[PDB]
Amino acid sequence: SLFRLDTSILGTRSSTIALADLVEREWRATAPDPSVVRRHLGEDPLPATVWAAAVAAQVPPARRAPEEREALSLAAALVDELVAAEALLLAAPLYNFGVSQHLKTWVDLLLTDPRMAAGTESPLAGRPAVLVTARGGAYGPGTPREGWDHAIGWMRRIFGDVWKLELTVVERELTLVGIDPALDRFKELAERVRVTTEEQARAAGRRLAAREGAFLALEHHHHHH
Template sequence: MNLFRLDASILPGTSSSAEIADIVEAEWTAAHPEATVTRRHLGTDPLPADTWTLATTAGFTPEVDRTPAQRDALVLSSALAEEVQAADAAILAVPFYNFGVSQHFKAWVDLVIAGAGPTTPLLKGTPTVLVTTLGGGYGPGTPRAGWDHSTPYLERILADVWQAELTVIKRELTLAAVNPAMEGLRDLAERQHSEALAIAREAGRSLAER
């Protein structure tokens, strides 16, 4: 058994997404103590920003004419795709930044697609938990309803393109505890925090059983 764990927080020491993902992973590893966990942390070990361009242009370049950088990019993109495809279960902890998906996570997705092809269902039938955390509130009726341009993209890639059996754990208002302007939302934020942790425990057990 192989669990693939990806993190994308740029603040790993205080990551809200990692806190939730850690609970999911703990439940999974408790059920599979001898299994392998393959980890990739894009926040602490980001992929080179130009690698996707190199891997993509290499696909349109005859092999004999590819530069060393293009060849290296193809090797990396293939390795990243294989890392995902080899998973028996997956956990992705992906925070929301600047109203969308962070560039370092998008670079990873683009490289995986370059390595596997744009329509390859890398996670088909694979139980997968997506943990995403948002500093503010973006639900219906909030001042910034509809500003979450990250979660729909994540669901599209994981569930629709890669065909994962996807469970989403979404926690909002993570900045309420430290932002004075959000003081009135702190009780709600704490309830959402507690609910997310409880959902994570259940999701981890379910992930282990599937």
């Protein structure tokens, strides 16, 4: 099955939901198990108080207080959702130059579970994940916003370096063109980016769906000779 995580707070208008929908459509069309499990942190955020309760409890059980037992039980349920998935679809818009408050809360709580604790091997290592992001402006090298996306590096750190996922990133920029008058000079560029990024999302879903066969077709395993 696919596990899909959404973080947009902009509801039916969400650009990330729309890109993730294109990935999911291709997954459903070609995946051996087209099943999808979904969690929408933007509509159903985790409580602001659970992480601190889980951290405190992270102590001999039995002594844990109700809020601490509830906090770690929720963290176990969230890890169960990820480890049950053959592949991940994660959607995270850029909000105030930084990480979604909802995504950070989710990762923080996941890492309180023993299977995701420091000095453990990632229970997700080698699994494929597509990360969908969107930005109102343009943040590539040479731009006035170069280095102003403080989220993407952290997401690449947790997903790729800590959990050891095989990460594909689809990023749609210039989503506030046609909304903020200051961006009007970008109108033609923004339309080419939308069309290109929508195709990248479809492409990402087709690749995610084929990963198991692609892995089985590999014979080169870096054996000595």
